[PDB]
Scaffold this active site. Structure first.
Site, mmCIF file in Angstrom:
data_model
loop_
_atom_site.group_PDB
_atom_site.id
_atom_site.type_symbol
_atom_site.label_atom_id
_atom_site.label_comp_id
_atom_site.label_asym_id
_atom_site.label_seq_id
_atom_site.Cartn_x
_atom_site.Cartn_y
_atom_site.Cartn_z
ATOM 1 N N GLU A 35 -14.194 -7.811 -8.264
ATOM 2 C CA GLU A 35 -12.332 -7.277 -8.217
ATOM 3 C C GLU A 35 -11.666 -8.005 -9.288
ATOM 4 O OE1 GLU A 35 -10.442 -5.872 -5.916
ATOM 5 O OE2 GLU A 35 -12.224 -5.487 -4.357
ATOM 6 N N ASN A 46 -2.532 1.210 -8.382
ATOM 7 C CA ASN A 46 -2.433 2.357 -7.509
ATOM 8 C C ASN A 46 -1.194 3.058 -7.724
ATOM 9 O OD1 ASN A 46 -5.034 0.553 -6.759
ATOM 10 N ND2 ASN A 46 -3.162 0.101 -5.755
ATOM 11 N N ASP A 49 -0.381 5.812 -4.063
ATOM 12 C CA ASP A 49 0.648 5.095 -2.688
ATOM 13 C C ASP A 49 1.338 3.607 -3.281
ATOM 14 O OD1 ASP A 49 -1.151 2.548 -3.490
ATOM 15 O OD2 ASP A 49 -1.265 2.686 -0.755
ATOM 16 N N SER A 51 1.250 0.780 -4.694
ATOM 17 C CA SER A 51 1.089 -0.244 -4.955
ATOM 18 C C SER A 51 0.080 -0.907 -5.819
ATOM 19 C CB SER A 51 0.331 -0.600 -3.740
ATOM 20 O OG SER A 51 -1.253 0.221 -3.257
ATOM 21 N N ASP A 53 -2.245 -4.348 -7.160
ATOM 22 C CA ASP A 53 -3.780 -5.201 -6.580
ATOM 23 C C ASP A 53 -3.201 -6.234 -7.587
ATOM 24 O OD1 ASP A 53 -4.728 -4.013 -4.858
ATOM 25 O OD2 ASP A 53 -5.479 -2.476 -5.680
ATOM 26 N N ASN A 60 -3.826 -6.607 -2.626
ATOM 27 C CA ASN A 60 -2.945 -5.734 -2.492
ATOM 28 C C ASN A 60 -1.003 -6.054 -2.098
ATOM 29 O OD1 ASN A 60 -1.300 -2.914 -0.815
ATOM 30 N ND2 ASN A 60 -2.845 -2.393 -2.620
#
Length: 130
Positions: A35, A46, A49, A51, A53, A60
């Site tokens: 990750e 991202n 959408d 959002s 991380d 998220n």
């Protein structure tokens, strides 16, 4: 900060991650490696959408933490996403624990399915003394 493998393995064990909800320490290590590369300040926007991380586990902002700019988001961990960017991973660990309490478990991260599931993950904790 960027953790060294065994350093992180020992930290996670002390924080109660080994076997948490049936998830072995090595699986958590495999997830953190893929990750963020053990990097606590890692962030990924991202664009599709809206959002982002955050941190070691790339948690998220649509469901887990609040960053204020993600549409129709909830904050199930009741934390500012800023808390997930600290050198001290205590909060990120508390939140990761919340994520896996949901039905999917560790499957919540697609990266786990792609690079950890059904694989030999012993290598992530070997020689660390955990």
């Amino acid at each position: 900060k960027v953790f060294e493998r065994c350093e992180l393995a020992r930290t996670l064990k002390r924080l109660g991650m080994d076997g948490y909800r049936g998830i072995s320490l090595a699986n958590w290590m495999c997830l953190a490696k893929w990750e963020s590369g053990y990097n606590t300040r890692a962030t990924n926007y991202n664009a599709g959408d809206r959002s982002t991380d955050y941190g070691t586990f790339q948690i998220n902002s649509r469901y887990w933490c609040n960053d204020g700019k993600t549409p129709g988001a909830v904050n199930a961990c009741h934390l500012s996403c800023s808390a997930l960017l600290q050198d001290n991973i205590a909060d990120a660990v508390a939140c990761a624990k919340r994520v896996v309490r949901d039905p999917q478990g560790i499957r919540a991260w697609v990266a786990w399915r792609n690079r950890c599931q059904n694989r030999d993950v012993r290598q992530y904790v070997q020689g660390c003394g955990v």
